[PDB]
Amino acid sequence: GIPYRTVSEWLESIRMKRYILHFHSAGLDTMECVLELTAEDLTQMGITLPGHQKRILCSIQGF
C-alpha cells in the first residue's frame, strides 16, 4: 500500500472508526497525514486507551 485510500476506510478496516472525529479535529484527513503518528501524538489527540493506540500504531506499521 498504503492499502487504504481514506482515513475513514482505514479506521473502519481496523474497527477504530469510533476515533474518526479525533483524527479530523487534529487535522489528519488523508492517509499521508498518519504515517508518522506516535503514542504521544495519539494521547495528545485524546486517544489514550493503550490497546487502541496499539491497534492504530500496529496497523500503520503493517502498511
State which residue, 32 or 43, has the beta carbon closest to Cl ion.
32
Residue 32 is a binding residue for Cl ion (CB under 5 A) = yes
Residue 9 is a binding residue for Cl ion (CB under 5 A) = no
Residue 30 is a binding residue for Cl ion (CB under 5 A) = yes
Residue 6 is a binding residue for Cl ion (CB under 5 A) = no
- The residues, ordered by sequence, that sit 6+ positions from 6 with a Cβ below 8 Å of its Cβ are 30, 31
Residue 37 is a binding residue for Cl ion (CB under 5 A) = no
CB 60 within 8 A of CB 37: yes
HSE (side-chain half, CA atoms, 13 Å) at 48:
3
Contact footprint for Cl ion (CB under 5 A): 30-32
